[PDB]
Amino acid sequence: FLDGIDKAQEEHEKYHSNWRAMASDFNLPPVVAKEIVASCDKCQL
């Protein structure tokens, strides 16, 4: 997601949260959360 991707994205942009945390915090399927991490230049899965 209910624009959860959008919210998780900004959370990560600031705190670079792990995928489990984003999956749980924004109710996103793991695959979507892991993609947010993969898209970031500052992280690794």
Residue 9 found at the interface with DNA (CB under 7 A): no
Q: Read off the amino acid at residue 31.
A: V
Is 43 annotated as a binding-site member? yes
31 binds another protein (CB under 8 A): yes
H/E segment holding residue 22? helix 19-25
Q: Considering the complex, what minimum distance in angstroms separates the CB of residue 31 from another protein?
A: 7
12 is in an annotated binding site: yes
Residues flagged as binding site: 12, 16, 40, 43
What residue ranges bind DNA (CB under 7 A)?
18, 20, 29-31, 37, 43-44
